[PDB]
């Protein structure tokens, strides 16, 4: 594909922009999905897992 | 000529068990010349590799040497035949009619051109046949056969490169 | 006579026993009159002195052997028949036949199938061995056995071992192959806890003319694709009878009401010219759509306010939309804007839904890490069937049965299924050898490559 | 010869416009006496090569 | 002329035989004719993707835009679209709301057609300088940024997969080496180090050693930046006031749960690209005086074992030279008659160090160091990397850059090890509490054959087990492997990793049992360690074996490539002490009972090599004499470490 | 290249397309009908040479190419009629001119094709009728062949028209037999498992031409007691009561070997011994195929039982304990007497022209291979030398004997027949070499060690092996 092929698609619709859009172009100068839920829910399950393991330990110190 | 296809070095391959030295009993070493006549024996991979012919059988032609001498006489190089049949009695009335000859009984079994014209079907190609196209005075090699065939003996290097 | 009372017979080694290979003898390499050995572990070929089976149990002391064909354990070495009831497992293990109610009862799966090693598992979740990088066709084909359909059509050898295939066909193999597999990954009593793909894999690469081998990888979606393919023309036998059972239990109907465009470098009346002499008309293709390829929407590759993870999410409902009739599509064909529109004229049983999460870039091959929100639990197509047969469809309730994630790059990347299960409720997720359990909501979590949803 | 014999077993087992080509490209350099040393092709003592005198 | 001048004809100008070369010239000349007749016909008549796509893009856009805003708006845009292409280098949204949707489509485009060309780009610039094509010093630095960038995207991208995937570890897993960990600690009865008392004996002599071995890092340059003196002026300040400095420090550990940005580049090494870490300056001090402690108060408890390798007891090389010393000191330790063969696998964790749960380590640190001061390093673990304008987190991969990566290294190995090693060997390992064992001995001579596992060597990131497996053992090994994994095809030996630096003889020489045996070994140890946690590749480990078919037992310690060959099958082999040879004598009997053939890694000479080109390449306008001194201390540095294995 | 054409000419019947069939196989005996597969023939053609011509029937008398029956046909096999002619037999196994004697193993160069090479190699030994393919306890998928020409084309249909991967081919071998030169050493007492049998066999060399004469099946077993206890006792000039012992015919029907029954009636019961008779003679048959020196066909032998314990019960006398027991003392009988392997000699009639006997006869000197017979051709110029090159030394000796004559000699070879190797195989003095040839006196104990080696059998084989005390 020509390098002018390329964005031959997008500059055939590009002149659609109207002259006050081609003139408001400012300066360069100025239900849904929780990805973090369950990883949050899956951490906070093996870190109790782990400290009821972690509450049968004989001798670990703690400095207040 | 350069390799067709890169080949791997001798130590990419590591003492396999039907690769290993210690096993193969060495009595002649196998040639270049001997695992490019039977490539699908004496080669691995033979990729592309294409045959060669059988040995055609031998042309056993005696070629003349002296016009004086007939055309079919049995020659000195030729070996010679150990003369040493339950052929029926003549008591019997097997008899020809008078007409009955040999077809080529006038025809003689020898002639002036006939060991000539036995000469020529042992010949190079333009010589063996009869009947040829005109080619082109650059398309006919006269040298050709020359180094095709095996180098002459004690030939110097440069002549043999 | 001798039968039901040797003493040989306390000698057979069960763990070594595995009948997953082919069927070949050692020595002779011949697949006539073969005979594997229960305590060598090997099989031989013959059945009697002078054959090779009496000189490897006389040399070897194995003298309790089995015949691959007859499936009769026999005392070679006397070439006395044994008759023992208790050794039908060894039977079983080599030739699993399901009876004709047992192949319907596998919703009713209750209690876990315990392997003749120490191993508790259930059938159906088991592993293929990859050997080598036969990941995808592994995972296409533990996710094919979850059908209950296929699963039923393959565990029943009566429903092909008639099929009018012509002699000199290599093709039949893959009909005949695959239903082995089937049926050894359903074995309630296997001898071990998992099946080798080793004979179904090799017949695969052998009937695909160099693609899709076990050594190099390939892509899941060909390969379902092409099995797919394979298994409707050889289930066909000898005529064009397209109501093959794959066919009818995982194809559908899909109406493209697609469309051209005119040109984009014309004014108006030379486009109008064309949208009115059918240069630009809009035709009904209707075709049998066995896969559709739900395509993801490519990664903004730009983040957000929302959002915390930058994995950009979709949900289901519009990435299927596509399909449906309003949505319209553009082709860009040589000289030429096809501008197209598909509709869902009619619903597979099963229908496989395989998203192309992997594109080629201008210098590269790139994967489209977007995430698909699909609930696991209930779906309804409905809403993007076609309008003239809508109330045709009287079920459109749609779960689903089984994912297959390609986790991991492009380049070097892994193959894993996570499939729902059926008799229990747990969408286990099942490794090329490791069967773990996965979370339902981990489940939506993982992109997903290929799908495969029960209408119920 | 002999020790060439058994390294060539053993190995078996395991610009500049140049105008005349170097003797170093040329081949026939073979250890064995018996395709060495060729019986020529003598035509049954009635033929012999070409171009010789 | 050699056919033509023979007999009365010798040698002469007369040869007249000229129609071969007449027909060369001649088909010579039919050849070139269509070439110089379409010269002569024609004398008569009457890689740069980016510019390239910036200008393009740019051309499409003043041909769109009006005359009216050609004017001087085509500057605006040109800014807009190097504001998009900086902003997806460094994952900074690119947001104009006051731009055209066309508009931003097409620069949307743009950018992706500049980012996947860079891309290409940066792959093929990699693979060039790992190969050890010709650059300079400007494309050198190009490629390493573009590198940079691309890794940091990478591993960004890869802790928002962690965690929307959440914890890999499972939770059954990880409380069942938790629950493995607490019994070898109960069984090791390792005294918990507690925090830094108010009055702690040698907290002077640590504080004041870890200041030291943070200061040696500035040497003496032109200048430094404002951080670097900043933290010049801060080690100055320490060491003026060490108590303060000292109670600083307590506070910071017991408070400062969340610091700050902690600064990534990328080390330019030819091969293998390695990050450098910086802390922030008073951040770094409470790291180093915090690492000094635990180092001190492991070393005290001896909590770290001794098959963890780096150590100051033993230099590497000297580490090399006592395993194959060791290795022959076992019983019976080359004895192949019987049918025994021995197998040492060298493994390294995979991605040991990026894999490492943050969360387990704070789980499991708090059984060894002080629940405070195991949260305090949990959170130091878990920072901001800033790098130019890219800034991205950290949850799931401990930073090697803190000064207490070494002690959070060695825990996590030990933790490892004592999977991998299990119970009974490691404890076997390690001896009795009371009279603890040295290295690679065991406490009694039936106590070295109690299990295949015989000697072993956890290095940094990098396992080396050595198993002496009996016949019976090795056979079963076999056969369970193949239960588990069958290869009915034959083709185990089609991936078995061998030495090639070595010749073929010495070689493993990949036998039947002998790749059988080992891909058990190889299974048997991957199967043992958690593949959530770490797990030891196939591929980039090595497993050798040493049996009636392999008389050479190879291994590559410490980037010393050496080979064991025992006398019993080098015989008829006199003993010639070459540079290279290291004669491994017995230990009671002290007669050389094998021969351990040395040899310098080919990582060590890749990386030797990488090292000159570097030197060479990166002189530039140094003078001459710090182009020598470099060299020099390369070369002092090669010869020093492999000092026989160079010859 | 995927389906096989079986061909042959029907004795009787009419075999037509659709029939079902009876293919019995190979060794489809009476007693043992288990090689039968009942097949349905289909589809057959007229033997024309370059185009077929199809046809419904085949009256008994002309040429069938079946198609369908070739599942079970591995080598040669006879249709019959499924459902009737319930007592019928196979037509006799072909019976070979010449021997073959050359082995080579074959490997694929990527493993896992490896199914693929082996349809492939059961494909061309079903093609080709006297190759004999096997895989021994090393894995070696030996192929053997008649000579040199013949292997080549077996690769070059192998790895171009059946299995298309490449496979690799090790360097060609000569298949060693092994032979006993002195008699027995000793009486070797072995006894089967229980210890309920205690047989005893003295070995000793076969007298010479009786060898020749039972492989050239002259002296056949097959005939009644009068006549070979006739041909034995006059052609042999064996005692009129040793030859009335005799037992089997060695390892085949037609075997180099002979078992006879030397037990002396005043201690062992005849009835008794031919009790365990037929487990003796299967031992002894299974003992000279295999061989105790280099797990190869032992020839030129007589094994003679000298004496025998034997157990009344058969669960205790006889079954499975007998024919062991039998292996082991057949091979303490034949390593006890001196052993020597031996070497196929391959005649070879080299027609080349008078003038150039002469580098023929020096070409074949570094061969190891003395000249027979020279002599001209009567009528022809070129003469036709005659002589016996070993084939073990015989690998290439065609290519040579036309590259040494300017490609003006012809050669051929054949199995003649078997020679002693000049040294000895039980000889732990002679060191070998990887890659030096062995010299003309070590080469008995070389071939040995290599073919224990190659075949992955111990390395060592005792006097002391398989003997009953150790």
Known sequence: PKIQQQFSDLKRKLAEVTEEEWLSIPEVGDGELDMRKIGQARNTLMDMRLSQVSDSVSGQTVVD | FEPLVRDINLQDEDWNEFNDINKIIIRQPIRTEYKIAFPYLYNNLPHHVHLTWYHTPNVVFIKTEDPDLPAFYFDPLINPISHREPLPDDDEEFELPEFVEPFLKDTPLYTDNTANGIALLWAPRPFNLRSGRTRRALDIPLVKNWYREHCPAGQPVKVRV | RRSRHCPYLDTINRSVLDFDFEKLCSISLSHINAYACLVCGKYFQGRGLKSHAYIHSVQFSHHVFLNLHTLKFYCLPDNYEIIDSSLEDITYVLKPTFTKQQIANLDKQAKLSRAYDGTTYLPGIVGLNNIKANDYANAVLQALSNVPPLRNYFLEEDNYKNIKRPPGDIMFLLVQRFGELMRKLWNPRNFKAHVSPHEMLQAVVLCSKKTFQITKQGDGVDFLSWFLNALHSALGGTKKKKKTIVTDVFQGSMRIFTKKLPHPDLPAEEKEQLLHNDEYQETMVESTFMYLTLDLPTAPLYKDEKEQLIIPQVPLFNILAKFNGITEKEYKTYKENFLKRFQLTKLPPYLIFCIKRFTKNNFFVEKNPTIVNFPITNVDLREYLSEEVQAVHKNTTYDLIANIVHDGKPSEGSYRIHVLHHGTGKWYELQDLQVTDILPQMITLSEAYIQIWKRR | ?53 | YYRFNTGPVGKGPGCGFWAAGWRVWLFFMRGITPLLERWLGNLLARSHFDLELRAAVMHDILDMMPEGIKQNKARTILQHLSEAWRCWKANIPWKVPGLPTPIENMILRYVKAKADWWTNTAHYNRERIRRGATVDKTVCKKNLGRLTRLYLKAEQERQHNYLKDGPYITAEEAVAVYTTTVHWLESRRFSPIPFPPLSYKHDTKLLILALERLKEAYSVKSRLNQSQREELGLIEQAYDNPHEALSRIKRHLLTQRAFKEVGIEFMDLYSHLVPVYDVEPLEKITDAYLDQYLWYEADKRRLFPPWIKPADTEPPPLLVYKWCQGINNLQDVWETSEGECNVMLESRFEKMYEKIDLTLLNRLLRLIVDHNIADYMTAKNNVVINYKDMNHTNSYGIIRGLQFASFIVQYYGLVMDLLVLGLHRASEMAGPPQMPNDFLSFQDIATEAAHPIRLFCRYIDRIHIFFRFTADEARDLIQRYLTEHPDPNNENIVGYNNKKCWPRDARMRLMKHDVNLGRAVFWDIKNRLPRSVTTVQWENSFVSVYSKDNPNLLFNMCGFECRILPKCRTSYEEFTHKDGVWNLQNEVTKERTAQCFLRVDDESMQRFHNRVRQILMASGSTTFTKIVNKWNTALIGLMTYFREAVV | GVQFHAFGRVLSGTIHAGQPVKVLGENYTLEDEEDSQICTVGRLWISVARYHIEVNRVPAGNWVLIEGVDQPIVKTATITEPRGNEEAQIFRPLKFNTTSVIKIAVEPVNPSELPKMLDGLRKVNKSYPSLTTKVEESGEHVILGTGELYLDCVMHDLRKMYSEIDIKVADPVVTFCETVVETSSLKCFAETPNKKNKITMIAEPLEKGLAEDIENEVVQITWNRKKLGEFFQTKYDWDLLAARSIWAFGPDATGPNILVDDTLPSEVDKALLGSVKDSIVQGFQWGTREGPLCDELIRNVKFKILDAVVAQEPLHRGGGQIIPTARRVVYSAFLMATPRLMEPYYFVEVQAPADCVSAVYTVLARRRGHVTQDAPIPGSPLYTIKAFIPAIDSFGFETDLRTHTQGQAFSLSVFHHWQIVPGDPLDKSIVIRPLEPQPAPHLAREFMIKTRRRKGLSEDVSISKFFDDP
């Open chain 4, 1 to 53: 010869d002999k020790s060439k014999e058994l390294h060539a077993i053993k190995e078996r087992y395991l610009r500049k416009f140049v105008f005349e080509w170097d003797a170093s490209e040329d081949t026939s350099i073979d250890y064995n006496p018996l395709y060495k040393e060729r019986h020529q092709v003598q035509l049954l003592g009635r033929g012999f090569i070409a171009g010789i005198d």
